[PDB]
Design a protein around this ligand. Sequence first.
Ligand SMILES: CC(=O)N[C@H](C(=O)N[C@H](C(=O)N1C[C@H](O)C[C@H]1C(=O)NCc1ccc(-c2scnc2C)cc1)C(C)(C)C)C(C)(C)C
Lengths: 86, 103, 141
Amino acid sequence: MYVKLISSDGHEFIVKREHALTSGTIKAMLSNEVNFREIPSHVLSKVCMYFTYKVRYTNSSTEIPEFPIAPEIALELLMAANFLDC
Amino acid sequence: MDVFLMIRRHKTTIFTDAKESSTVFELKRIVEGILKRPPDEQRLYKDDQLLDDGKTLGECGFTSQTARPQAPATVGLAFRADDTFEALCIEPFSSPPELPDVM
Amino acid sequence: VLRSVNSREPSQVIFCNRSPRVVLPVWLNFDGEPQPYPTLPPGTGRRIHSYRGHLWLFRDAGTHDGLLVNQTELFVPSLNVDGQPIFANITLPVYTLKERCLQVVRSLVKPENYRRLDIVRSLYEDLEDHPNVQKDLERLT
Ligand SMILES: CC(=O)N[C@H](C(=O)N[C@H](C(=O)N1C[C@H](O)C[C@H]1C(=O)NCc1ccc(-c2scnc2C)cc1)C(C)(C)C)C(C)(C)C
């Protein structure tokens, strides 16, 4: 079961529903496509990678690597994380 | 071992994982479940290289240490409209702004 | 409340830094005051002498970001069974995306410039409200 998340510039990201439910905001917008008018593709792609990372490394034994964030996207990514509550 | 992938065509990007030991064809079956297009109407690419159906993802260079959850590897996807295959085309993501002065 | 107990029963420990951060070990003394100890560079270990019932926590030495030790907040040396040291494995937690973004922004912007960033007032307060052991002691209490 997948959901579609669409960036402000029209990029369509298809991710597993349970990964997307990492965000309580996204859960509300579903409860199965969501448009984000303020989140561009270079930010929303990173959010999707965060979902995969969180689900993979939550309650895991193996060593956890740093989630990497380029300085150029940090501000927009910060605003998106604040909105998405993840 | 799991490999983490972004399968990309035009403005579509699929986030999924697969086994290193799974095949290219099996990856097409995953795309088929999501985009409703059968394997024979799909071509998968690593960069500009067309991938062979019977090869494992590991043989094609998708390994657990390079195709990571937080930095997944890209697989290009092209569809056959009716008779002929469209050319591989992946729309880039948007560009971030200039760093502000304070950053 | 959160204080070490003065047991006097020795316990050898390996602090093992399996994080990419420089780590600050912090011992909570008998009055509950945080006492900082020498730092551990990324990927390094130290054999140290502590005591049963002593409380420790671990932070990024530069930023005070929270770290886990054996998957929890606090570490208490236990009885050494057959002379083996207790392993304290120090790891990154899975930070929320928000906290991770705040970390990166703080690492790039001098605090006197937080107010120059074009963001809602609440995110200014989140940048300024940086991680700190005293506040985490208040929370854990
Ligand atoms: C004074 C008291 O009531 N009890 C003593 C006691 O608890 N002493 C403390 C003590 O020796 N402690 C407190 C912690 O359990 C650890 C231990 C200690 O300081 N061990 C020396 C040490 C030196 C360097 C390190 C570290 S941490 C990262 N790198 C290093 C080298 C770790 C431990 C001090 C009060 C002297 C700080 C005791 C009689 C048990 C010896």
